[PDB]
Design a protein around this ligand. Structure first.
Ligand SMILES: [Co+2]
Length: 207
């Protein structure tokens, strides 16, 4: 049916979503799950802040719809089409790039097609498991330990790291034969719904 999650709103804005939820029998909740159909983002006149419910909503190929969908529907006294209120961007993508759009559609071809991803080392604003769930949702396979990468030709190993959090290293290459990228690779790739070329995110691996 319809399950809504909400992001970046104030209490008085949450209340309007609540009103809208009651009028149209839409379950409204706090946490985002697979069962959620809609993510309601706060936007400007339709770019939003990159949030966890934003990445996960896109990762699930959901309706990542601007808060304007609600108030306009409240004002026009019926459920408007999500189509005309869907979010277009953030800071990885200004105004137009169609992150959520590529995603609602593409579910056949997922950006992390046949990939083995390892979120290695400490992580901060984005928990290891949230990045893992994100990465899984885009079609990848999660590896927990560097030595657990499949010894088979068909998959490509990637090591995702968040530099700031440690005090990972430049010595991952010493423990495995995988490209090591910064977590921004995952975040952008998901934001934009297009697998980013590892090139700009690769980290110095010391021989
Ligand atoms: Co290849």
């Amino acid at each position: 049916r319809m399950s809504m999650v909400v992001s970046g709103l104030t209490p008085e804005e949450f209340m309007l979503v609540y009103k809208f939820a009651r009028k149209h029998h839409i379950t409204l909740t706090n946490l985002i799950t697979e069962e959620t159909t809609h993510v309601v983002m706060k936007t400007d006149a339709f770019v939003c802040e990159r949030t966890l419910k934003y990445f996960l909503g896109i990762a699930g190929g959901k309706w990542v719809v601007s808060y304007f969908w609600v108030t306009q529907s409240i004002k026009e006294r019926k459920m408007l089409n999500e189509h005309d209120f869907e979010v277009r961007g953030d800071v990885v993508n200004g105004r137009n790039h169609q992150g959520p759009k590529r995603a609602r559609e593409s579910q056949d071809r997922k950006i992390f097609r046949g990939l083995e991803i390892c979120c290695y080392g400490p992580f901060t604003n984005r928990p290891t498991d949230q990045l893992e769930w994100m990465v899984q949702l885009c079609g990848a396979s999660v590896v927990k330990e560097l030595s657990s990468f499949t010894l088979g030709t068909g998959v490509h190993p990637i090591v995702v790291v968040q530099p700031d959090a440690w005090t990972g290293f430049h010595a991952i290459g010493q423990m495995c034969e995988a490209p090591v990228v910064t977590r921004e690779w995952v975040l952008d790739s998901v934001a934009l719904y297009q697998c980013q070329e590892l090139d700009t995110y690769l980290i110095p691996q010391i021989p």
